[PDB]
Amino acid sequence: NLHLTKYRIKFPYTAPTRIVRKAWTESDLKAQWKVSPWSVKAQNICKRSSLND
Amino acid sequence: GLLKEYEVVGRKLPSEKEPQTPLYKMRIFAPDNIVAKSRFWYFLRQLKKFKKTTGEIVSIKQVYETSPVKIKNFGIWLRYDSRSGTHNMYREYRDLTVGGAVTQCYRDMGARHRARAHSIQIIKVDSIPAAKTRRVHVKQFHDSKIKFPLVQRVHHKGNRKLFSFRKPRTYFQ
Amino acid sequence: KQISKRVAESKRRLKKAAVIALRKKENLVRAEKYQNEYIKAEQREIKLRRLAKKRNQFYVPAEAKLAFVVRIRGINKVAPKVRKVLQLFRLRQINNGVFIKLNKATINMLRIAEPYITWGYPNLKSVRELIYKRGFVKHNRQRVPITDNFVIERKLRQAHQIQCVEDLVHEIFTVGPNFKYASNFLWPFKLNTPTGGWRKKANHYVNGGDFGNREDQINRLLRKMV
Amino acid sequence: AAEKRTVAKVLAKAKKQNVELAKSHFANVATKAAANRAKLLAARKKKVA
Amino acid sequence: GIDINHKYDRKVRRTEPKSQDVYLRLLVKLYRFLQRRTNKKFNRIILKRLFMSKINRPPLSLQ
Amino acid sequence: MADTQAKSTTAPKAAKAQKAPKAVKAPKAEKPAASEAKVSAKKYKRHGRLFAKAVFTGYKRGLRNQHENQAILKIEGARRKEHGSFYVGKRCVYVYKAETKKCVPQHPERKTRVRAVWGKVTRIHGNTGAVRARFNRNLPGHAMGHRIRIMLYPSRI
Amino acid sequence: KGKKHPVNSYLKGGILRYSKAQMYKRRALYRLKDKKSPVVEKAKVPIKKSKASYPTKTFVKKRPSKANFSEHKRNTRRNLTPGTVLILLAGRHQGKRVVLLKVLASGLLLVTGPFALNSCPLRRVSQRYVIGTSSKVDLGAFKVPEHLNDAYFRRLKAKKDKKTGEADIFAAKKERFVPNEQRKKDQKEVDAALLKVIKAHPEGKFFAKYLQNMFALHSSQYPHRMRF
Amino acid sequence: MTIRPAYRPKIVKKRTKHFIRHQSDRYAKLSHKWRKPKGIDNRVRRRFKGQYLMPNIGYGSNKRTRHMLPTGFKKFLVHNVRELEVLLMQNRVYCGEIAHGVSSKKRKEIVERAKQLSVRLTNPNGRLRSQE
RNA sequence: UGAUAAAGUGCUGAUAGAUUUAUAUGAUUACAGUGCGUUAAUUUUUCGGAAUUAUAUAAUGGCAUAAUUAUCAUUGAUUUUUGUGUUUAUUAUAUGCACUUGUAUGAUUAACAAUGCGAAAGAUUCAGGAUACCUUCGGGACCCGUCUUGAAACACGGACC
RNA sequence: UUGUAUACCUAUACAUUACCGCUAAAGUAGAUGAUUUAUAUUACUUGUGAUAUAAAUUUUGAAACUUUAGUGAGUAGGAA
């Protein structure tokens, strides 16, 4: 139940959650992911999804 | 089921000739606490006298792994009954909880040695560090930085479409 | 004479609903005493366990009275010493439940009759739901549902002191001195079948599941059957 | 008491909107929030016995 | 399945005379009324003995 | 998070408002800044304003006895449990053809030249969206494979 | 005065009276006038009203009568509130998308096409033949005149001829099919109030004119994850 | 029609078919009328599946509507005119059926007298002779 | 964090069923609810509105002791029959008269609406019907009598009336 | 194949309900102005009771009606 993206942030292999949270922000991953080539494709199926009469 | 651990304590209920019997305790792995109070009695009948009816069960309480997201190697000292066969083993598993490694051992013995579970006595269960493990299928994972490309998914059956129009395609790029 | 019949049967009507209104008032002050007993009992055991941890001891809680005993298997291929315990427990049909006191004379009957039976230790909620929803009662050898407190009171108030339903829930749950009458007054509880069904029916509970002492998991199984 | 847990929830949620106080979504809220003045009497006027 | 209903589930008393004498069954009409409406066991003995046979109602002497 | 049981399925009743728990999205988000949630339960097929497709696949049976009062019906797009329960409650029909009346054009103008046997969906059958129906007469069995129609009424939402 | 108040009708086994309601009686006005009403009598001016005994020295008969009469109450509807664009699932206007106006005091639904768009009049639909869609037109001050209720268009009558009698009179019946002119008058009042508020928004395939195109269910569809 | 019973009940029949003697299809010497099979191996008698059913008493009719005709009424054979007058007081509960051997000459009085007494007959217009 | 437990917790959506000849020989019984009801304060949306507080008696809890009874362990803790006030909470009783389409109808199923008129002789509408069949289809399904531990038996008898 | 997980399907078993039987228990028998029920006059308690005048149900094949419970396999065989 996992599907792998192209992003690899950097933290130690035995890090706690605050080090992981610190590294998402420095990578600018939220701004990169929502404009990534087919996270766009995600939200068009989400738009197409169930679609009022 | 999933086999969480308990501490079952037992006495030998003290007829007045003897005051304050010596109180032995355990580490029982069991699906539920009704079956942990016949694993206490099975294991103690090897060790001290006092069966039930002639003993008591003082506090059986569940123990809740003390670091559920730390990642550690569990060595299990076992002994089982094969078809010709009482043996000892020392198996090593890699998990987060200690009831989850014991239950990863009760399947493995069933797979690899056919070991239906009434044959398995567990001696000890530890959290050995690393460079004390031996068990090459556990030492695979004792190296940062580990890579392995994946090939593993779900492939619904029939699907959200049984007669598909577009071919699942195990690969891309 | 009919000129005296309205004279007689209008005070026999006035006194009649003075009794019923009297016993409506007892059964609220009666069942409030009982319901406060159970709350103090539960907060006692919480208090005692939390004391014995701080006093660096153990608190072994009380071994249980009140089995609820269900017949789970068969009327075919049964041995005569286990056929006979199941007629002394009034367990003559599949999914028949009765209430049993746990003295040593009956545990060695619950061990004779073990593979045909499951038992365990009921809650208060399981005592109520079996007498509310499923509780029938025995009126001159006939089986009479409940539908009011007059079916319980008309047979157990001159001799014993049971008039309400919560009376009958009291001297069954807290095993009282008229438990012998409080549980032979009932019919055997003709329970349904579980929802989700069973586990194996011919292994012990502690093997992989069914017969014998489930012991606290008789509650979860009575939710399916009641 | 379940009807009293409701009023403490819809009051404490609506501190970001705090509109009314009249009849629509706050009849079952702000009426009983000001009927604690109707139990101001019970502490004040009942100590005459 | 339940248990187990041989006998004498069906009780083997009499509930009526075996007797087509009309003067005898008029006394059964009285004594069912008399037993039911006066619940004396005198009147239930007379009723139950009025059903009986020539054996079970033996003669009795004048002495 | 079962201490947050009131705030998992929480969006619309606080968007209504009925006692207002928490009106936050959980949307299978096309709005992308916090894109979450479970592209949950789909399986599309069509047919259907009235006359949603079912086929009478056979009676509701065990392997050697048949019980020809309930009837299993496979509906066109449904193949999980959530999908076959939409139709639960609703009214079904087996409509087919005969030739001869024993009736008149009292109503529309007929030789009574199309028959119908109505029924209800009572419940679901497996884990894949099959369903169980209970018609007024009984469904003759040469109806197996043929079209049953799931009328969208008695209409819930 | 007040404070009697049965406030059960939701909860309802904790039914909110009898911890309070008996606590207002200081023996208030223990009175009666209360006639033992002597109208029922064998009372004659000369009339001799007695009454009579017709056959109740009777028919030889348990003459046909059935048991007795428990009655209609609580009406509960789904959360469909006007003006939602419903979809008429059934009954002679099937497929057409109509607009809600109000509910009855019998749980029915008052719907117009409007008649200029759908050719669907002011008629009444059971909400078991309606899909209440997500398209709602805002009607922030619309009247819905209060003579529009259950006894309005409601059936009568077929006299079958003139109420003449039991003669067998020949063919050429024209029995009912009016509609009245006050029937026609009303959906000039509510449609002119609707065809201004329908048109009041930026248009789409219904929302300001095109509400005329009759829901059908095409290929690659559902009933069961179609958010209607 | 004529005087329908006394707020009639809806008759529920446990099964409508009748009972067919085992192997009565194989032989033209076996009537279909039910005989209990006594044979030691008989798969009907031993109640195997697929076979012809036996009449037990769970099939018995409701005691309210036992012997009620479809028209609501129990049946009463009528043999002459004075026997019809017994139904003067039973016409809310009984039909009347003229006995097969009552002639056409005398069946005319009986259908006459049973409009006056309002007896619903089961076979009116039988053995007429609908002429003069 | 989770697990176990309990509170008509509450809500939602369904399914199947609904004896009942209330006297072809015993009250439609009681309960409960709704309608006119001396007041006086205190609030409330402000509408015929609505809430609260104020009356005696009887309890029951929470609290503060003083007794008492009796026990795991006793620095104390649990417990039975009490007592009285300190007290702060909660239930019950004190709703009579007349009326009414509000429960058990003392196995309740009862209502709104659509279709269809049982025509003087004879149509039609709705529901039902293995009548002896025929048509169609799915499931079931060996041949009876018999002796036998065991019969469909490659045991015997029986071509048909 | 071994060890498990949920979710389903399936008896004539189990639960509820309708109906048949069997079993076991219980009720009912003033008919003459007997019993009720609704009104209509008086003794009186406020209210009830009694006299009177206004409609019915009941001659329960007493071997009949009415009420409630449980129950149901069967060769040889017995019995209604």
Coordinates of C-alpha atoms in Angstrom, one line a residue, chain G:
Chain G
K1 CA -51.8 29.7 32.5
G2 CA -49.1 27.4 31.4
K3 CA -46.3 25.0 32.5
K4 CA -48.0 21.7 31.8
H5 CA -46.0 20.7 28.7
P6 CA -45.4 17.2 27.3
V7 CA -41.9 17.6 25.9
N8 CA -41.3 13.9 25.2
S9 CA -41.8 13.9 21.5
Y10 CA -38.1 13.3 20.6
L11 CA -36.1 11.8 23.4
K12 CA -38.4 10.0 24.6
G13 CA -38.2 7.7 27.6
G14 CA -36.9 10.5 29.7
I15 CA -40.0 12.5 29.0
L16 CA -39.3 15.6 31.0
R17 CA -42.5 16.0 32.9
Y18 CA -42.8 14.3 36.1
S19 CA -39.8 15.7 38.0
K20 CA -41.4 19.1 37.8
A21 CA -44.9 19.4 36.5
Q22 CA -46.9 18.5 39.7
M23 CA -45.4 21.3 41.7
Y24 CA -47.7 24.2 41.0
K25 CA -50.9 23.2 42.9
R26 CA -51.7 25.1 46.1
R27 CA -55.3 23.8 45.7
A28 CA -56.1 26.2 42.8
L29 CA -59.9 26.8 42.2
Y30 CA -61.3 23.4 43.0
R31 CA -64.6 24.0 41.2
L32 CA -67.2 22.4 39.0
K33 CA -70.3 23.5 37.2
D34 CA -70.3 20.6 34.8
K35 CA -73.9 19.7 33.9
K36 CA -75.1 16.1 33.9
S37 CA -76.4 17.2 30.6
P38 CA -80.1 16.4 30.5
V39 CA -80.5 16.7 26.7
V40 CA -80.5 12.9 26.2
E41 CA -84.0 11.9 27.1
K42 CA -87.4 10.6 26.0
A43 CA -88.2 14.3 25.7
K44 CA -91.4 15.5 24.0
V45 CA -92.9 18.9 23.5
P46 CA -95.0 16.7 21.6
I47 CA -92.1 15.1 19.6
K48 CA -91.4 11.8 21.4
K49 CA -87.7 11.8 20.5
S50 CA -87.3 8.6 22.5
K51 CA -85.6 7.0 20.3
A52 CA -87.0 3.9 18.5
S53 CA -85.9 0.2 18.2
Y54 CA -85.6 -0.3 14.5
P55 CA -84.3 -3.7 13.8
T56 CA -82.0 -4.1 16.7
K57 CA -84.3 -6.9 17.3
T58 CA -82.0 -7.6 14.6
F59 CA -80.7 -9.1 11.4
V60 CA -79.6 -12.8 12.0
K61 CA -76.2 -11.6 11.8
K62 CA -72.8 -10.3 12.7
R63 CA -73.6 -7.6 10.1
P64 CA -70.3 -6.4 8.5
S65 CA -68.1 -4.2 10.8
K66 CA -64.4 -4.3 11.4
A67 CA -62.2 -3.3 14.3
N68 CA -61.6 0.3 15.2
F69 CA -59.5 3.0 14.0
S70 CA -56.1 4.1 15.1
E71 CA -55.1 7.4 13.5
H72 CA -52.6 9.4 11.3
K73 CA -49.8 11.5 12.9
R74 CA -46.1 12.3 12.7
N75 CA -44.8 13.3 9.3
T76 CA -41.0 13.2 8.8
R77 CA -39.2 14.2 5.6
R78 CA -35.7 14.1 4.4
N79 CA -33.6 17.3 4.5
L80 CA -34.9 18.5 1.1
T81 CA -35.9 22.2 1.6
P82 CA -37.3 24.6 -1.0
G83 CA -36.3 25.5 -3.5
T84 CA -34.3 22.4 -4.5
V85 CA -34.4 21.2 -8.0
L86 CA -35.9 17.8 -7.5
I87 CA -35.9 15.0 -10.1
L88 CA -39.3 13.5 -10.6
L89 CA -38.5 9.8 -10.6
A90 CA -41.9 8.6 -11.5
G91 CA -45.5 9.3 -12.4
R92 CA -46.3 10.9 -15.7
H93 CA -43.7 13.7 -15.4
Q94 CA -40.8 11.2 -15.0
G95 CA -37.4 12.5 -15.7
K96 CA -38.4 16.2 -15.5
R97 CA -36.5 18.4 -13.0
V98 CA -39.0 20.4 -11.0
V99 CA -38.5 23.0 -8.2
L100 CA -39.7 22.6 -4.6
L101 CA -42.0 25.2 -3.3
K102 CA -43.1 23.8 0.1
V103 CA -44.2 20.6 1.9
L104 CA -47.8 19.8 2.9
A105 CA -49.2 19.1 6.3
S106 CA -49.4 15.5 5.0
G107 CA -45.7 15.2 4.0
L108 CA -46.2 15.7 0.3
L109 CA -44.2 18.1 -1.8
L110 CA -45.4 21.2 -3.7
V111 CA -43.6 21.4 -7.0
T112 CA -43.8 23.5 -10.2
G113 CA -42.0 22.9 -13.4
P114 CA -42.3 26.0 -13.7
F115 CA -45.0 25.5 -16.3
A116 CA -43.3 27.7 -18.9
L117 CA -40.1 25.6 -18.8
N118 CA -41.0 22.0 -18.0
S119 CA -44.7 22.0 -18.8
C120 CA -45.1 20.6 -15.3
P121 CA -47.9 22.3 -13.3
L122 CA -48.4 23.0 -9.5
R123 CA -48.9 19.4 -8.5
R124 CA -47.9 17.2 -5.6
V125 CA -45.2 14.6 -5.3
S126 CA -44.5 12.0 -2.6
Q127 CA -40.9 12.2 -1.6
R128 CA -40.6 8.5 -2.3
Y129 CA -40.6 9.3 -6.0
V130 CA -38.1 12.1 -5.9
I131 CA -34.3 12.4 -5.9
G132 CA -33.5 15.6 -4.1
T133 CA -30.5 17.0 -6.0
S134 CA -27.9 19.4 -4.9
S135 CA -29.2 22.2 -7.0
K136 CA -31.2 24.7 -5.0
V137 CA -32.5 28.1 -6.1
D138 CA -32.6 30.7 -3.4
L139 CA -36.1 32.1 -2.8
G140 CA -35.4 34.5 0.1
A141 CA -38.8 36.2 0.1
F142 CA -41.2 34.0 -1.9
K143 CA -44.8 33.8 -0.6
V144 CA -46.3 30.4 -1.5
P145 CA -49.9 31.6 -0.9
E146 CA -51.6 29.8 1.9
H147 CA -54.6 28.4 0.1
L148 CA -52.3 25.9 -1.6
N149 CA -52.9 22.9 0.6
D150 CA -54.3 19.4 0.6
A151 CA -57.9 20.1 -0.2
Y152 CA -57.2 22.3 -3.2
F153 CA -57.1 20.4 -6.5
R154 CA -58.3 17.3 -4.7
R155 CA -60.8 15.0 -6.6
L156 CA -64.5 15.5 -7.3
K157 CA -66.7 14.4 -9.1
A158 CA -68.3 12.0 -11.6
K159 CA -72.1 12.5 -11.4
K160 CA -72.3 10.0 -14.4
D161 CA -75.3 11.9 -15.6
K162 CA -76.8 15.0 -13.9
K163 CA -77.7 13.0 -10.8
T164 CA -80.9 12.1 -12.6
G165 CA -81.4 8.6 -11.2
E166 CA -81.1 4.9 -12.1
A167 CA -81.8 5.3 -15.8
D168 CA -79.4 3.6 -18.3
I169 CA -78.5 6.6 -20.5
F170 CA -76.4 6.2 -23.7
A171 CA -72.8 7.3 -24.7
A172 CA -70.8 10.5 -25.3
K173 CA -69.6 11.2 -21.8
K174 CA -67.4 14.3 -21.1
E175 CA -66.8 13.9 -17.4
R176 CA -64.1 15.9 -15.7
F177 CA -61.1 17.3 -17.5
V178 CA -61.3 21.0 -16.7
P179 CA -58.6 22.5 -15.0
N180 CA -60.3 25.5 -13.3
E181 CA -59.4 29.1 -14.2
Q182 CA -58.3 29.8 -10.6
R183 CA -56.2 26.7 -11.2
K184 CA -54.6 28.4 -14.2
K185 CA -54.5 31.7 -12.3
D186 CA -52.2 30.4 -9.6
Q187 CA -49.2 29.4 -11.7
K188 CA -49.2 32.7 -13.3
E189 CA -48.6 34.1 -9.9
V190 CA -46.0 31.6 -8.7
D191 CA -44.3 31.1 -12.0
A192 CA -43.9 34.8 -12.6
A193 CA -42.3 34.8 -9.2
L194 CA -40.3 31.8 -10.2
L195 CA -39.2 32.7 -13.7
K196 CA -37.7 35.9 -12.2
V197 CA -35.7 34.1 -9.5
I198 CA -34.7 31.2 -11.8
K199 CA -33.3 33.8 -14.2
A200 CA -31.8 35.7 -11.3
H201 CA -28.5 33.8 -11.5
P202 CA -25.6 33.3 -14.0
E203 CA -27.1 30.6 -16.2
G204 CA -26.2 27.0 -16.9
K205 CA -28.0 23.9 -18.2
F206 CA -30.8 24.6 -15.8
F207 CA -30.1 27.3 -13.5
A208 CA -31.6 30.3 -15.3
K209 CA -33.4 28.8 -18.2
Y210 CA -32.5 25.4 -19.4
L211 CA -34.2 23.4 -16.7
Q212 CA -36.2 21.6 -19.4
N213 CA -34.0 18.7 -20.4
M214 CA -35.4 15.6 -18.6
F215 CA -32.9 13.5 -16.7
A216 CA -32.0 10.2 -18.2
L217 CA -29.2 7.7 -17.4
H218 CA -26.8 7.1 -20.2
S219 CA -23.7 4.8 -20.5
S220 CA -20.9 4.4 -17.9
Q221 CA -23.0 5.7 -15.0
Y222 CA -24.5 4.6 -11.8
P223 CA -27.2 4.9 -9.5
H224 CA -24.8 4.2 -6.7
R225 CA -22.0 6.8 -6.8
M226 CA -23.9 9.4 -8.8
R227 CA -24.1 12.4 -6.6
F228 CA -27.4 13.5 -8.1

